[PDB]
Amino acid sequence: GQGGGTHSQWNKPSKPKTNMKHMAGAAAAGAVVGGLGGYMLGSAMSRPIIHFGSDYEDRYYRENMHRYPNQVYYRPMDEYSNQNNFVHDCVNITIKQHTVTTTTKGENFTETDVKMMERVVEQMCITQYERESQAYYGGHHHHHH
């Protein structure tokens, strides 16, 4: 037999729209340190893989590795009586420099993300503490004769 039910469409359901897409004022360029004033950069060696409790959680952190920085900026002068220039100043300064990105371009990090990077920053800071500072301050330079 046969009957109705068949139907057709020119190509696709559609609705009208203004379709204009002119835009300006949503771009920036340059290596802007902001107001850091020349803080010193650590060592570009891959950060450790943080274990929370089990690999299902670490798996999540591994995907966001491209979201977090892999280096830390610290004060190029130990003004304090011990290396308080390290760790303490670096956990702030790096995060404060990165958060500017969200006010400039709107980057959409969520609270879970920041909680994980606040842990990795500490570890990458512990890593150069024995490397960069050893080469510069540890290697006590002295004049020739």
Tab-separated table of C-alpha atoms in Angstrom:
chain	number	residue	atom	x	y	z
A	1	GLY	CA	0.000	0.000	0.000
A	2	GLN	CA	0.972	3.676	0.168
A	3	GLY	CA	-0.006	6.749	2.178
A	4	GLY	CA	1.080	10.202	3.298
A	5	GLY	CA	3.862	11.124	5.716
A	6	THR	CA	6.597	12.078	3.264
A	7	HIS	CA	7.985	15.609	3.572
A	8	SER	CA	10.979	17.589	2.301
A	9	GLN	CA	12.997	20.697	3.204
A	10	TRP	CA	15.145	22.900	0.905
A	11	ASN	CA	18.254	21.819	2.902
A	12	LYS	CA	17.961	22.607	6.625
A	13	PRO	CA	15.814	24.168	9.358
A	14	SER	CA	16.798	27.853	9.535
A	15	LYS	CA	15.789	31.155	11.183
A	16	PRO	CA	16.707	34.740	10.255
A	17	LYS	CA	19.572	36.588	11.982
A	18	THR	CA	21.299	39.979	11.609
A	19	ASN	CA	24.571	38.136	10.805
A	20	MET	CA	26.792	41.220	11.294
A	21	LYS	CA	29.955	40.306	13.210
A	22	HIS	CA	32.082	43.450	13.327
A	23	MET	CA	34.055	43.623	16.592
A	24	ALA	CA	37.051	45.532	17.993
A	25	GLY	CA	38.800	45.903	21.372
A	26	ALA	CA	39.189	42.205	22.232
A	27	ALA	CA	42.903	41.646	21.552
A	28	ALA	CA	46.236	42.223	23.323
A	29	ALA	CA	49.843	41.217	22.545
A	30	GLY	CA	53.324	41.346	24.171
A	31	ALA	CA	55.069	39.570	27.052
A	32	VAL	CA	53.416	41.680	29.753
A	33	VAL	CA	54.934	41.035	33.199
A	34	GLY	CA	52.383	43.474	34.525
A	35	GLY	CA	53.781	45.217	37.589
A	36	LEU	CA	56.255	42.539	38.709
A	37	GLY	CA	59.222	44.779	37.925
A	38	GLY	CA	61.652	42.123	36.651
A	39	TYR	CA	61.278	38.983	38.780
A	40	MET	CA	63.715	36.120	38.059
A	41	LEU	CA	62.552	32.950	36.208
A	42	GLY	CA	63.268	29.360	37.364
A	43	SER	CA	64.210	26.147	35.570
A	44	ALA	CA	62.125	24.817	32.566
A	45	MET	CA	62.255	21.104	33.510
A	46	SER	CA	58.945	19.170	33.670
A	47	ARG	CA	57.065	19.402	36.958
A	48	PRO	CA	56.405	16.276	39.039
A	49	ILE	CA	53.212	14.267	38.644
A	50	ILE	CA	51.110	14.945	41.742
A	51	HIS	CA	49.346	11.978	43.303
A	52	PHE	CA	46.224	12.862	45.261
A	53	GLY	CA	44.940	9.451	46.431
A	54	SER	CA	44.672	7.331	43.286
A	55	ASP	CA	45.373	7.480	39.551
A	56	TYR	CA	41.689	8.424	38.620
A	57	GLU	CA	42.310	11.836	40.146
A	58	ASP	CA	45.856	12.223	38.796
A	59	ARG	CA	44.422	11.406	35.350
A	60	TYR	CA	42.382	14.637	35.610
A	61	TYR	CA	45.408	16.714	36.632
A	62	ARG	CA	47.347	15.340	33.631
A	63	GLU	CA	44.841	16.813	31.128
A	64	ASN	CA	45.117	20.281	32.657
A	65	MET	CA	48.943	20.223	32.538
A	66	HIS	CA	48.648	22.566	29.498
A	67	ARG	CA	46.689	25.091	31.614
A	68	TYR	CA	49.207	25.577	34.439
A	69	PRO	CA	52.617	27.262	34.277
A	70	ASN	CA	55.742	25.077	34.591
A	71	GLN	CA	58.074	27.744	36.032
A	72	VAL	CA	58.130	30.054	39.077
A	73	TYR	CA	59.250	33.723	39.539
A	74	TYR	CA	61.024	34.744	42.766
A	75	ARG	CA	62.738	37.836	44.172
A	76	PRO	CA	66.242	38.211	42.614
A	77	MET	CA	67.611	39.330	45.992
A	78	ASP	CA	67.456	37.557	49.323
A	79	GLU	CA	66.632	40.609	51.433
A	80	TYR	CA	65.730	38.302	54.303
A	81	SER	CA	68.152	36.584	56.728
A	82	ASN	CA	67.373	33.181	55.147
A	83	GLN	CA	66.004	32.244	51.671
A	84	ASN	CA	62.426	33.399	52.400
A	85	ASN	CA	62.611	34.861	48.892
A	86	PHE	CA	61.840	31.316	47.788
A	87	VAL	CA	58.572	29.335	48.018
A	88	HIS	CA	56.785	31.993	50.114
A	89	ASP	CA	57.109	34.742	47.464
A	90	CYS	CA	56.805	32.427	44.448
A	91	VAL	CA	53.457	30.831	45.235
A	92	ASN	CA	51.895	34.321	45.192
A	93	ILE	CA	53.767	36.075	42.430
A	94	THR	CA	53.236	33.349	39.754
A	95	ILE	CA	49.501	32.972	40.592
A	96	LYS	CA	48.997	36.756	40.688
A	97	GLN	CA	50.652	37.071	37.281
A	98	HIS	CA	48.550	34.236	35.782
A	99	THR	CA	45.164	35.462	37.082
A	100	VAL	CA	45.574	38.655	34.994
A	101	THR	CA	44.822	36.459	31.960
A	102	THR	CA	41.200	36.060	33.071
A	103	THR	CA	40.651	39.831	33.321
A	104	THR	CA	42.226	40.372	29.890
A	105	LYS	CA	40.767	37.508	27.794
A	106	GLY	CA	38.257	35.742	30.039
A	107	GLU	CA	39.934	32.271	30.368
A	108	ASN	CA	37.341	30.193	32.398
A	109	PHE	CA	39.393	28.334	35.023
A	110	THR	CA	37.146	26.804	37.734
A	111	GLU	CA	37.776	26.373	41.495
A	112	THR	CA	38.869	22.746	41.121
A	113	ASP	CA	41.605	23.825	38.746
A	114	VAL	CA	43.189	26.439	40.967
A	115	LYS	CA	43.182	24.064	43.938
A	116	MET	CA	45.395	21.668	42.008
A	117	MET	CA	47.844	24.322	40.692
A	118	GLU	CA	48.255	25.824	44.222
A	119	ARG	CA	49.723	22.389	45.097
A	120	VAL	CA	51.992	21.997	42.040
A	121	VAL	CA	53.477	25.498	42.458
A	122	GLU	CA	54.923	24.504	45.814
A	123	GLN	CA	56.655	21.465	44.284
A	124	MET	CA	58.160	23.242	41.283
A	125	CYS	CA	59.400	25.847	43.754
A	126	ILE	CA	61.097	23.178	45.886
A	127	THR	CA	62.783	21.963	42.650
A	128	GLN	CA	64.797	25.118	41.631
A	129	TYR	CA	65.566	25.967	45.187
A	130	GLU	CA	68.441	23.403	44.952
A	131	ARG	CA	69.361	24.251	41.342
A	132	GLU	CA	69.204	27.947	40.280
A	133	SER	CA	70.195	29.372	43.679
A	134	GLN	CA	73.087	26.905	43.869
A	135	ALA	CA	74.556	28.101	40.575
A	136	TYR	CA	74.177	31.831	41.283
A	137	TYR	CA	74.558	32.386	45.048
A	138	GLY	CA	76.069	29.029	46.013
A	139	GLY	CA	78.879	29.343	43.484
A	140	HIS	CA	80.709	32.105	45.376
A	141	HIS	CA	82.275	34.181	42.591
A	142	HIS	CA	85.572	35.910	43.456
A	143	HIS	CA	88.020	38.244	41.688
A	144	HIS	CA	91.117	37.121	39.753
A	145	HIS	CA	94.679	38.353	40.393
